[PDB]
Amino acid sequence: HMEIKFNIEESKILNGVYIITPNKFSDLRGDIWTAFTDEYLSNLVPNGIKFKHDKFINSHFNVLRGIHGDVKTYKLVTCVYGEVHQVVVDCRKDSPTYLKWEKFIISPRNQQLILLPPNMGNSHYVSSKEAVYYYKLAYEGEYLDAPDQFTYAWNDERIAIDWPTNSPILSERDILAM
Amino acid sequence: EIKFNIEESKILNGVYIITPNKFSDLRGDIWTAFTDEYLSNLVPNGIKFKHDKFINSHFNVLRGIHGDVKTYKLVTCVYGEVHQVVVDCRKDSPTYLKWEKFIISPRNQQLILLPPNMGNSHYVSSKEAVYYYKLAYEGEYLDAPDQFTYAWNDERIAIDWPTNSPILSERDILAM
Numbered sequence A: 001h002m003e004i005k006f007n008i009e010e011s012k013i014l015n016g017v018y019i020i021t022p023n024k025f026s027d028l029r030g031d032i033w034t035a036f037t038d039e040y041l042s043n044l045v046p047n048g049i050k051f052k053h054d055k056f057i058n059s060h061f062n063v064l065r066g067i068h069g070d071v072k073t074y075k076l077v078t079c080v081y082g083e084v085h086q087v088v089v090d091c092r093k094d095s096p097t098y099l100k101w102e103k104f105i106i107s108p109r110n111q112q113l114i115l116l117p118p119n120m121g122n123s124h125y126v127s128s129k130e131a132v133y134y135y136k137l138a139y140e141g142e143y144l145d146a147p148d149q150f151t152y153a154w155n156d157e158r159i160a161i162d163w164p165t166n167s168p169i170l171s172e173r174d175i176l177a178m
Numbered sequence B: 001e002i003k004f005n006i007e008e009s010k011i012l013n014g015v016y017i018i019t020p021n022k023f024s025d026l027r028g029d030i031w032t033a034f035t036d037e038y039l040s041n042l043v044p045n046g047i048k049f050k051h052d053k054f055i056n057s058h059f060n061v062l063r064g065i066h067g068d069v070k071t072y073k074l075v076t077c078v079y080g081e082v083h084q085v086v087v088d089c090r091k092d093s094p095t096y097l098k099w100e101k102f103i104i105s106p107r108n109q110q111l112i113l114l115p116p117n118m119g120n121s122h123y124v125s126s127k128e129a130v131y132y133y134k135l136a137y138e139g140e141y142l143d144a145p146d147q148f149t150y151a152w153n154d155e156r157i158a159i160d161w162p163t164n165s166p167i168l169s170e171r172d173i174l175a176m
Ligand SMILES: Nc1nc2c(ncn2[C@@H]2O[C@H](COP(=O)(O)OP(=O)(O)O)[C@@H](O)[C@H]2O)c(=O)[nH]1
Pocket: A001, A002, A003, A004, A005, A023, A024, A025, A032, A033, A034, B053, B055, B063, B064, B066, B143, B144, B169, B171
C-alpha cells in the first residue's frame, strides 16, 4: 500500500528469467505503483549494465509481435493497460531449455514485470481491445535495431507456443519469419 | 532512428518539452520515452533517472499540486488523456505561480521535464488514463510527508481546469 516493495521470483523452468511483482497504493481515484528503482532491481543485471532505455508499444486486439531478441539486451517487460500473453523463448543453444518457452498473462489486475536476459526470444499477443506494453532495456553501447536482431516465427513448429489465435495481425518482418 | 525534439518552455524557464517520434503501422505504435544518451543532459552531473512510476486514474480525477526540494520529473500519459499542469513553485523565479498546460495523450505524446520545487498536477479527461513518471534524485525517495501541496484551484495560480468538481484525495482537499 504505502512503502515501495517488490517480490522477485526466478522462473522455475527458464534459468535467469525473473517475475517481479510490485505492490500498489489503491483508492477510489485508481492506483500508484513503482515499476522500477535502481536500489531494488539494478542487481538483476550483471555489473555496470544499466537499464537506460524505456519503450512503449501500443497494440490492437489480436496483434502478435515477435519472436525477437539479440545478444546485448536485458528486457524488463509488463502491460500497464489491457492484457497480453507475454511469451519468453529460451534461445540459448547451451541451455537445457533451448527453444522451450514460458507464458505470463500480464495486465494491471496481475501486474508482473518479466526480466529476460539477452539471447532470449521476446513476444506478446494482445488479448484485450487495446494494450500498452512497457519495457526497460539494459545494454552497453548502441541499441540493436531490427536488422541486427534475430526473428523466430510466432508459430515455429520446434518452439510450438500455445497462442489463442491462428490469424494474428503481423508485421512483414514477423510474416517473413514464417 | 529514435528521434527526440528537446524544446524549453516559452513560459517557465528550466521546463523542457520532449517530443518522441513513433513507428506506426497496422499493429499500433512503437516509441522510446527515454534514453540516458538523449535525455541525461536535462539533469545535473551525478543525478540519474533511477525510479519509474505509473499512476492509473479514472475520469475526472485531479491529482496535485505536488512538489519537493530535490526531484526532477519526466511525466507523460501513455494511455487516455490528461490536462498536465506544471506550476512554477520556485519563489526566487520571476514566474512563481505561473503555469503551463499540456493536453497529453497517445495523439500528443509530449514528455514534460520538471525541475525541483515545481508544482506537478494532472486532470483525467478520458474514461481512464495511465500517467507515466520518471524520477531523478540523489538519496532516498521523498514521499508525501516530505512534499509540498498547492491547492488545485488556488486563485493566486488561477489554473484553467475543465471542471469545478474534480475527484480529489484528502491531501488535495486539505490544500483547499
Ligand atoms: N505502493 C506504493 N505506494 C505509493 C507509491 N507512491 C505513492 N504511494 C502511496 O500512495 C499514497 C498517496 O501518495 P501521494 O503522493 O499523496 O499520491 P498522489 O495523489 O497520486 O500524488 C501515500 O500513502 C503514498 O505512500 C508507490 O510507488 N508504491
